[PDB]
Design a protein around this nucleic acid. Structure first.
Ligand SMILES: [Mg+2]
Ligand SMILES: [Mg+2]
Ligand SMILES: [Zn+2]
Lengths: 94, 158, 104, 158, 1112, 83, 227, 39
DNA sequence: TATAATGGGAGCTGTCACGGATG
DNA sequence: CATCCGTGACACCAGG
């Protein structure tokens, strides 16, 4: 089971809104090279390689943990779409 | 094939299947590491079986990290005929199915086969991991009673 | 523009001729020697489109620079060959014929 | 847990209920010779007698299991829900039971052998009628169920 | 080892030749060994006699035919993809009626396929098997009317496609109606056309109440035969000019023409027997002396009236009775197709006979053989009954040859067959097996011929019974049909005999299938054996009397799927039939006469017979079957060995010393194992791989062609562009892989170059050429490579070329190359095992030997079967087979326990006692007492009530052993299994369903022409189908995006799939999809139906999904 | 009015859904005569076109939701907090 | 054919003196259980500890009697004494008798036992009994060194006529769970990973117990030397 | 399937059809699947 | 390119429900 | 307001 899945289902009014939020956040992380993450260095999800631990490349695991922190705001009509795009491109270049 | 060591959210996926199923991801990750100069060279390297070395399998491990595949068994009588699993790479050529999901697929191990599907996008992967993962669909949509529940040997030993 | 509805309706003879890129006058399919589509046949490139991308039948024009050009020697437009999946022809009947769907 | 032939315990009571039945058979035979019972009445009485005999021998098998061999493999598997129902256990330990002709009409002569004792050629052939009937019925039923499901989906999809 | 045999029944007669239904039928159809003048009017001879003479003028009559010798032997036909056939000549003579000129000639009519020794054919190189067809026997039947209870339908049925069905009915208005070609008309009309006057019909039918008055119509008797004839012709031919010589012709061709209408000889016999009359030919009437004379109609109407009234001795007919259903063997089917081809040939003959020279016409100039040839070639290549031969093992071929299908040309259309055709009719006893039949749609429609059963000359299946006179059972054996069988009280084959006399006051018998307890004074016949009730596969199931029929079905069908193993073993517990199955299937090679074995080789065996002759027997070594299984023979004799007639010389595939060897005798323990045998899965020991148990050889054929092209020749070459020496390492000088190489997926088997098209280089190509300074070669690599997940060792290469002697390929082909790749498949996780009792399971786990449960003396078990598979399936036979297998493990002997008459529990327990002595007194002598763990297990068994409290350890261990149970030690811990476990030897086969052939995956690959969707199937490197129900699953989940991926990006969104692949290889997230191509195909195919489909926006303005590419 | 499941499905408003079920020619002719416009309300109509179905993650009730971190959220609140 | 075996890394994960997880990977195929089972048997049967083996309570005849002035019956007191974690600081000491005399309103703990030289009661806060106004408890308990588990009716040791024998819970280890999981090293596919889990009572620690176990097993391996 | 109020967007109709149809092959004195279809 | 020639020929054998035609 | 008749529909995957 996804860690903390019951809490995530508690955070939304419809289980499918949780999925929309998580997938959008994962695409946001993928586009900006994870530079906009709300996770501290210790909260970063890790992946065990042959050499040693590395950053988990799965943007969805990241998005779900970020949602679990509470440091994310989700809802309808928060900001015009292109405004959000350009502000995230300014704060985090590609 | 039954895998009783799996956790409810896992299945056993052969290496030679997962290589082909995830092949573009594998080309990209092979280029990220030193395994090939470019994508075309990585594809040419995977073309022949004797040209494949262990770094390819270790990079395939990183390709699939956190991802889920869909397992389907015909006939798909209800929505639990498709369920999402984190693939555990195994030697051999047989898919390893968790015992507690058998009943929901109506699957036994007297020769049955199952289809595997790779959800590509982050959106499809989020749908699969949240909505269709096996460990989240524990109760029947039809009656609400437990569907993934102890069966046969489990009940016998208990 | 986003697709939101799908209408279906009867098509007039004028509408069908509006669709058509040329009448198919001959029952021939392809030449038995050259294995190329015959003229005015069921596979004519003059009607339905080029077999090769941006290349007319005879070969006078063979690059994308010519686009929309209709060759004067063979009559084949220079477009993507994909259009052979999309371009209707038509057959003008000597006597009208009933659409059996609306009969039986 | 295992299954050996000595685990299909035939109860002591069985023989009694067989003789006790044969006795009550002739009481129905004589009543037919003297016009008391008609043909169909005698047939119905024979069938009811044998149904109740089958019930009694099933109860005998399970009471013997419960009281004398509480950890009998068949009994444990049935009780827990791991495998088997009472009727299969009865066919293994007690008697096979009444068998049906191709016309659905039941044979007056029931298979008195369990699967441990082994059936006779005639008993096996008589049972093949019902086996084939059930198989053909299942085959013809799955297609009707599929058509029904497709109609339901098409009428409720929006 | 010793083979102890159980059973008290004496087999009076052996099993008949098991493939006689094929060989005898085809022999009778051909009559090739019969001199022409002695031939009977049957088979292709009868077809010739039916077609000829051909009249109108000229006349072309038929004298005789003859079948020459095959131009090539069977193996050469198998290699060259030819047909094993014999030339067909027919001596014909042409006669001019006026001129009297008689010209004679022997015309060649093409080839006819010959049946091999084992009853199969070779059609274009592939072994095939014509399957017998069960159908409703021709004749006159009377069935109850479903709507009207007191009324009955009289049906008249000829052979299939040999005349129309006729129905006779008593209508609600009283008149008697006849239905022909779906035309109801009063029968009185036809009766009048036959010449029946009211006198005869009144004196013939008046006795049956007022029914005869339904046949009294004055407007019909008012006219003579000709007027009523034209009346009926008008009633049957609306519009056709009712000419006299047209009406006579139509009526003759419909009712009395032997070349158009034909009951069978069986239909003739059954009509004669049912109606109590005698027939002249095989039709319903005759044209004698110019007028029509009745044969069948008056007796049929008489019987129908007698059945409706209630006259005694007239009953309706059971159309499921095997006395009313008959078999059409290979000969009858091939003869029907021969007859069709001959009729077409005769049409062409008359065509050439009307407009020719009228004098310069020889039989050769009149006969075009082609319409005949095709009609035969179509039958053997594209009939529902010309099936690809199943030669997985010898038993599979034998079973295939003994099949019976209700399907096929003239048979039941599936999805339309009800319960009646599929039911086990009581008359199936001894004729058709009640067990062997497919599970699924074909249930009850594909069946198997019983073991002792024979098909007689008329087509009905006959079964044997012993004659019993005055309680004495003779050795006279009578083969009966079901109709004949219904006359007698037939006792069961297990009734006790004191040597020839019935030794039981009450015996069990059958009267019309009904079971009955009778006295020996009433017994008229007796069964031959239990074996006669079941098929050959079912007969190979020991302890069948203990298995429910549903799993007996699976155990029967699955022997057909057993793979010949390199170390195959006969079952420890046999049924006594494992030898006849090897012998009749032509599996093994036997001695023709008594003699001494001169030479023994890996490839041949030379024997000197008592006649002094030196006969050499070649051995088929490592040949590929239809299913890729290896069919090789191995010599079982040695130099100098004396052999008698019928002695084994060479074991075939799946044969151990002449016994059927479909699997291995493994040591099984019946216990759970940590979930690794959950739900029918099986756990095996690595020792099985170490000693090569369940290892099979499989050969695959790969084929390539180099052909002439409009753009230059394809040539098979080693000169393949852009390849290293590493890529061409194992290729010979001509480009073909060398025998002995090890080929893996990706390796080249045959090199081939093909010229490219126009291939106008895009500017990127030109610039790359200039940068690298290498001319683009004129040809490209189109070599044959090893498919994914295949490969092995090259064992053969065949190369045929145009210009080589004896070779001629199809037009355009310059050359053909074939490569044979052999592989040795060990058992692996995912391969399917099964026993003979319906216990099937896939190997889920291979443990190392040290993890396997082991006996106290350190012997590990081979297989671990889960006990939960037994109770729900009710197949206790495998349990008994295990128990006996335990005894034979320590006594060192096998057994023969015939079905329904074999080893009983007390005898098995005697053997188990002897085995326990062998198993335990050894240890007591070697200086070891009973083990502590054994004591604990004995305590547990005492708690379970399995052993008597108070006895010594040895006594209790012996009691357990007699129950078939032993102490077992967990190999991982050394502690014992808390209870005693059933352990013993079991016969287990490796079925043909190996995961090596089924594992498949695909990222991207070939797409379809019109739909632009992925192809299907492993061989096409295709994608799995996501059908309607999988879509329903995703919808019910709410996986909108996953579903949209399935519908667009993964199947037929061209732009979408291209962009998705590019995004994934670049590390980018996949793009939003676009319109899938198949919707554009739908829109265009609707436009082709004059329907305008318009994608609109929310403003109802058209949206162009074709991006302007189709708008002028 | 009471209809069985088959006739109720074939009488539905959307002709893409009706023609994809049964009686394809009858449904198509009656829809073409009437110039029916399928509004793509159901799941079948959208599956046929390859559109995102109006269910689950495709429901208009949830598919327009936005996600933004408080960093970017306040960096955007400042922009408006300026003009 | 040619093999190379990296020496396995041994990993410890403890929580106080009561519990620890012990991971040893990678191991060649099968050696996970080959190492785990003997160590488990040894840790449950042969690690030296202490145990209450006999109890005399004044004016109490048999074990199933009640006691006036005390709420618990004798059985409950014997259970609480079974849970007494006593440690012997001196390796030569083999047996002690502990005295306990109290009365009045009081809840006796394991502290109230009179201290004896080189006998450390690890759990002094362990409840023993509650007494009331007029309740008197004079008892002597016998603490012996030993291994494993011995029922009371198997030693039956009686210092006097009314000394009740107590099931001797010698073992300092309370539970040993172990589990082997498949693991891979590069393209070695069926290697094993051992995970031990040891619960003790604090007298001996899990790591100490495991080391004593491996020492016992090695010393037993040395017994194949002198025929 | 979650023992909590339904989430909006659930695709209830498909779940209903599959819930009714999935035991269809188990419907075997009674009236059975023919009775279900007749209804 | 010219004697005269003037109307075919298979067909081959479900099971149910539903809506429309007829009678 | 009935009977008769023509026309629909009759499970999924796999390999073929
Ligand atoms: Mg199965
Ligand atoms: Mg391992
Ligand atoms: Zn041009």
């Amino acid at each position: 089971a996804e860690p903390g899945i019951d809490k995530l289902f508690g955070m939304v009014d419809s289980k499918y809104r949780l999925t929309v939020v998580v997938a959008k956040r994962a695409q946001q992380l993928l586009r900006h090279g994870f530079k906009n993450t709300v996770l501290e260095p210790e909260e970063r999800p890790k992946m065990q390689t042959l050499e040693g631990l590395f950053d988990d490349p799965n943007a969805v695991t990241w998005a779900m943990k970020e949602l679990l922190t509470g440091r994310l705001v989700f809802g309808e009509n928060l900001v015009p779409e292109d405004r959000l795009q350009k502000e995230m491109e300014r704060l985090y270049p590609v | 094939v039954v895998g009783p060591q799996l956790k409810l959210h896992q299945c056993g996926l052969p290496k030679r299947m997962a290589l082909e199923l995830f092949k573009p991801f594998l080309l990209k990750k092979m280029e990220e590491k030193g395994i090939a100069p470019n994508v075309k060279a990585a594809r040419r390297m995977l073309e022949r079986q004797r040209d494949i070395k262990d770094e390819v399998w270790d990079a395939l491990e990183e390709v699939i990290h956190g991802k889920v595949v869909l397992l389907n068994r015909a006939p798909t009588l209800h929505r639990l005929g498709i369920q999402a699993f984190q693939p555990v790479l195994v030697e051999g050529q047989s898919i390893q199915l968790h015992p507690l999901v058998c009943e929901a697929f109506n699957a036994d191990f007297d020769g049955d086969q199952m289809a595997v599907h790779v959800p590509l996008s982050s959106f499809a992967q989020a749908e699969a991991r949240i909505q269709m993962l096996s460990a989240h669909n524990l109760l029947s949509p039809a009656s609400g009673e437990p569907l993934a529940k102890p069966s046969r040997d489990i009940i016998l030993g208990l | 523009k986003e697709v939101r509805k799908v209408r279906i309706a009867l098509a007039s003879p004028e509408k069908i001729r509006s669709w058509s890129y040329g009448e198919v006058e001959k029952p021939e399919t392809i030449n038995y020697r050259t294995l190329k589509p015959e003229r005015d046949g069921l596979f004519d490139e003059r009607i339905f489109g080029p077999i090769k991308d941006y290349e007319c039948a005879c070969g006078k024009y063979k690059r994308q620079r010519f686009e929309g050009k209709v060759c004067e020697r063979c009559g084949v437009e220079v477009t993507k060959s994909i259009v052979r999946r999309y371009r209707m022809g038509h057959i003008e009947l000597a006597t009208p014929a009933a659409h059996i769907w609306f009969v039986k | 847990i295992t299954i050996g032939i000595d685990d299909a315990v035939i109860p002591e009571e069985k023989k009694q209920y067989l003789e006790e039945a044969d006795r009550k058979l002739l009481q129905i035979e004589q009543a037919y010779e003297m016009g008391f019972l008609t043909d169909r009445e005698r047939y119905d009485q024979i069938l009811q007698l044998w149904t109740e005999t089958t019930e009694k021998v099933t109860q005998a098998v399970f009471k013997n299991f419960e009281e004398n061999y509480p950890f009998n493999p068949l009994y444990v598997m049935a009780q827990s829900g791991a495998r088997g129902n009472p009727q299969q256990i009865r066919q293994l330990c007690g008697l096979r039971g009444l068998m049906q002709k191709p016309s659905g009409e039941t044979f007056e002569v029931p298979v008195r052998s369990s699967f441990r004792e082994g059936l006779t050629v005639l008993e096996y052939f008589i049972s093949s009628h019902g086996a084939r009937k059930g198989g053909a019925d299942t085959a013809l039923r799955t297609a009707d169920s599929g058509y029904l499901t497709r109609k339901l989906v098409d009428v409720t999809h929006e | 080892m010793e083979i102890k045999r159980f059973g008290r029944i004496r087999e009076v007669i052996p099993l008949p030749p098991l493939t006689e239904i094929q060989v005898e039928s085809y022999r009778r159809a051909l009559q090739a060994d019969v001199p022409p003048e002695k031939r009977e009017n049957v088979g292709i001879q009868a077809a010739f006699r039916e077609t000829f003479p051909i009249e109108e003028g000229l006349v072309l009559d038929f004298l005789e035919y003859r079948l020459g010798e095959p131009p090539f032997p069977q193996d050469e036909c198998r290699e060259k993809d030819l047909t094993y056939q014999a030339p067909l000549y027919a001596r014909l003579q042409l006669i001019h009626k006026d001129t009297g000129l008689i010209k004679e000639d022997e015309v060649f009519l093409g080839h006819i396929p010959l049946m091999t020794e084992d009853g199969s054919f070779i059609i274009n190189g592939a072994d095939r098997v014509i399957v017998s067809q069960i159908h409703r026997s021709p004749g006159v039947y009377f069935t109850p009317d479903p709507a009207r209870p007191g009324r009955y339908i009289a049906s008249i049925i000829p052979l299939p496609k040999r005349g129309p069905w006729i129905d006779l009915e008593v209508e609600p208005n009283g008149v008697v109606s006849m239905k022909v070609n779906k035309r109801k008309f009063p029968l009185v009309l036809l009766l009048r056309v036959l010449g029946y006057d009211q006198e005869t019909l009144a004196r013939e039918l008046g006795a049956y109440g007022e029914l005869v008055q339904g046949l009294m119509d004055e407007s019909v008797f008012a006219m003579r035969p000709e007027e009523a004839l034209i009346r009926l012709f008008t009633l049957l031919r609306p519009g056709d000019p009712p000419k006299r010589d047209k009406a006579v012709a139509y009526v003759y061709g419909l009712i009395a023409d032997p070349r158009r209408y034909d009951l069978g000889e069986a239909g003739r016999y059954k009509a004669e027997e049912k109606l109590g009359i005698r027939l002249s030919g095989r039709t319903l009437a005759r044209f004698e002396d110019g007028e029509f004379k009745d044969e069948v109609f008056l007796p049929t109407l008489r019987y129908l009236f007698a059945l409706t009234a209630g006259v005694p001795g007239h009953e309706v007919d059971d159309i499921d009775h095997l006395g009313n259903r008959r078999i059409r063997t290979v000969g009858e089917l091939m003869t029907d197709q021969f007859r069709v081809g001959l009729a077409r040939l005769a049409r062409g003959v008359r065509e050439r006979m009307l407009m020719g020279s009228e004098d310069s016409l020889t039989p050769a100039k009149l006969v075009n053989s082609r319409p005949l040839e095709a009609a035969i070639r179509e039958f053997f290549s594209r009939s529902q009954l010309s099936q690809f031969k199943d030669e997985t093992n010898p038993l599979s071929s034998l079973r295939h040859k003994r099949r019976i299908s209700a399907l096929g040309p003239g048979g039941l259309t599936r999805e339309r067959a009800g319960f009646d055709v599929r039911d086990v009719h009581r008359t199936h006893y001894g004729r058709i097996c009640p067990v062997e039949t497919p599970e699924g749609a074909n249930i009850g429609l594909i069946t198997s011929l019983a073991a002792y059963a024979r098909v007689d000359e008329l087509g009905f299946i006959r079964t044997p019974y012993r004659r019993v006179v005055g309680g004495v059972v003779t050795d006279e054996v009578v083969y009966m049909t079901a109709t004949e069988e219904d006359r007698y009280t037939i006792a069961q084959a297990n009734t006790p005999l004191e040597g020839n006399r019935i030794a039981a006051e009450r015996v069990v018998a059958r009267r019309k299938g009904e079971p009955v307890i009778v006295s020996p004074e009433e017994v008229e016949f007796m069964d031959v054996s239990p074996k006669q009730v079941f098929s050959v596969n079912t007969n190979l199931i020991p302890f069948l009397e203990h298995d429910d029929a549903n799993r007996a079905l699976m155990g029967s069908n699955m022997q057909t799927q057993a793979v010949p193993l390199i170390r195959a073993q006969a079952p420890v517990v046999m049924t006594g039939l494992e030898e006849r199955v090897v012998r009749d299937s032509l599996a093994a090679l036997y001695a023709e006469e008594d003699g001494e074995v001169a030479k023994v080789d890996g490839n041949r065996i030379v024997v000197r017979y008592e006649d002094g002759r030196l006969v050499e027997y070649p051995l088929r070594r490592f040949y590929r079957s239809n299913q890729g299984t290896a069919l090789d023979q191995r010599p079982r004799v040695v130099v100098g060995q004396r052999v008698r007639k019928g002695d084994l010389l060479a074991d075939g595939p799946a044969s151990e010393n002449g016994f059927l060897a479909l699997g291995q005798n493994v040591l099984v323990a019946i216990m759970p194992f940590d979930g690794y045998n959950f739900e029918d899965a099986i756990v095996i020991s690595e020792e099985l791989l170490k000693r090569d148990f369940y290892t099979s050889i499989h050969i695959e054929r790969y084929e390539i062609e180099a052909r002439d092209t409009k753009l230059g020749p394809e040539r098979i070459t080693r000169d393949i562009p852009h390849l290293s020496e590493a890529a061409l390492r194992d290729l010979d000088e001509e480009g073909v892989v060398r025998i002995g190489a090890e080929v893996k997926p990706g390796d080249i088997l045959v090199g081939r170059t093909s010229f490219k098209g126009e291939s106008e280089p895009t500017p990127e190509e030109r610039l790359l050429r200039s940068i690298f300074g290498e001319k683009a070669r004129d040809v490209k690599d189109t070599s044959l490579r090893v498919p994914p997940g295949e490969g092995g060792i090259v064992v053969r290469t065949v190369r045929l070329r145009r210009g080589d002697p004896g070779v001629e390929l199809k037009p355009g082909v310059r050359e053909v190359v074939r490569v044979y790749v052999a592989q040795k498949r060990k058992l692996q996780v995912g391969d399917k095992l099964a026993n003979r009792h319906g216990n099937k399971g896939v190997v889920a786990k291979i443990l190392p030997v040290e993890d396997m449960p082991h006996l106290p003396d350190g012997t590990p078990v081979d297989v671990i079967l889960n006990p939960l598979g037994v109770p729900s399936r009710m197949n206790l036979g495998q349990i008994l087979e295990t128990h006996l297998g335990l005894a034979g493990y320590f006594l060192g002997q096998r057994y023969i326990s015939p079905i329904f008459d074999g080893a009983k529990e007390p005898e098995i327990k005697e053997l188990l006692a002897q085995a326990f002595e062998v198993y335990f007194g050894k240890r007591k002598g070697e200086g070891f007492g009973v083990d502590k763990r054994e004591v604990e297990v004995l305590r547990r068994a005492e708690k379970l009530g399995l052993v008597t409290p108070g006895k010594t350890p040895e006594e209790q261990l012996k009691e357990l052993f007699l129950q078939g149970k032993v102490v077992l030690y967990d190999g991982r811990t050394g502690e014992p299994i808390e209870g005693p476990i059933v352990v013993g030897q079991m016969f287990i086969m490796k079925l043909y369903h190996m995961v090596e052939d089924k594992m498949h995956a695909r990222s991207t690959g070939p797409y379809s022409l019109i739909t632009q969707q992925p192809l299907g199937g492993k061989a096409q490197f295709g994608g799995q189908r996501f059908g309607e129900m999988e879509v329903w699953a995703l919808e019910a989940y709410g996986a909108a995006h996953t579903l949209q991926e399935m519908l667009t990006l993964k199947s037929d969104d061209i732009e979408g799939r291209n962009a998705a692949y590019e995004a994934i290889i670049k590390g980018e997230d996949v793009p939003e999809p676009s319109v899938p191509e198949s919707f554009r195909v739908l829109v265009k195919e609707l436009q082709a139906l004059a329907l305008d489909v318009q994608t609109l926006d929310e403003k109802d303005n058209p949206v162009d999904i074709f991006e302007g590419l189709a708008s002028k | 009015l009471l209809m069985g499941v088959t006739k109720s499905a074939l009488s539905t408003k959307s002709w893409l859904s009706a023609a994809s079920f049964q009686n394809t020619t009858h449904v198509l002719t009656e829809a073409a005569i009437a110039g029916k416009k399928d509004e793509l309300i159901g799941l079948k109509e959208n599956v046929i076109l390859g559109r995102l179905i109006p269910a689950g993650t495709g429901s208009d009730f949830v598919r327009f939701t936005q996600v933004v971190d408080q960093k970017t959220l306040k960096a955007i609140e400042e922009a408006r907090k300026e003009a | 054919l040619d093999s190379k075996l990296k020496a396995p890394v041994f990993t410890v994960r403890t929580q106080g003196r009561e519990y620890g997880e012990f991971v040893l990977e990678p191991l060649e195929r099968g050696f996970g259980v080959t190492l785990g089972n003997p160590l488990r048997r040894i840790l449950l049967s042969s690690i030296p500890g202490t145990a209450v083996t006999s109890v005399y309570i004044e004016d109490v005849l048999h074990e199933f009697s009640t006691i006036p002035g005390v709420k618990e019956d004798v059985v409950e007191i014997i259970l609480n004494l079974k849970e007494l974690v006593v440690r012997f600081l001196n390796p030569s000491l083999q047996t002690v008798t502990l005295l306990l005399k109290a009365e009045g309103p009081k809840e006796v703990k394991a502290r109230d036992f009179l201290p004896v030289a080189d006998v450390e009661i690890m759990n002094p806060d362990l409840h023993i009994a509650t007494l009331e106004e007029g309740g008197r408890l004079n008892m002597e308990v016998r603490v012996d060194r030993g291994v494993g588990y011995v029922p009371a009716e198997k030693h039956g040791i009686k210092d006097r006529i009314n000394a009740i024998p107590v099931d001797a819970v010698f073992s300092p280890v309370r539970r040993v769970a172990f589990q082997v999981e498949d693991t891979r090293l590069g393209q070695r596919t069926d290697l094993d990973k051992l995970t031990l889990r040891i619960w003790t009572d604090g007298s001996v620690t899990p790591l100490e117990a495991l080391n004593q176990a491996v020492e016992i097993l090695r010393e037993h391996l040395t017994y194949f030397s002198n025929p | 399937s979650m023992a909590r109020p339904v989430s909006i967007g659930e695709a209830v109709g498909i779940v209903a059809a599959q819930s009714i149809g999935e035991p269809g092959t188990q419907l075997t004195i009674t009236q059975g699947l023919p009775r279900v279809i007749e209804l």
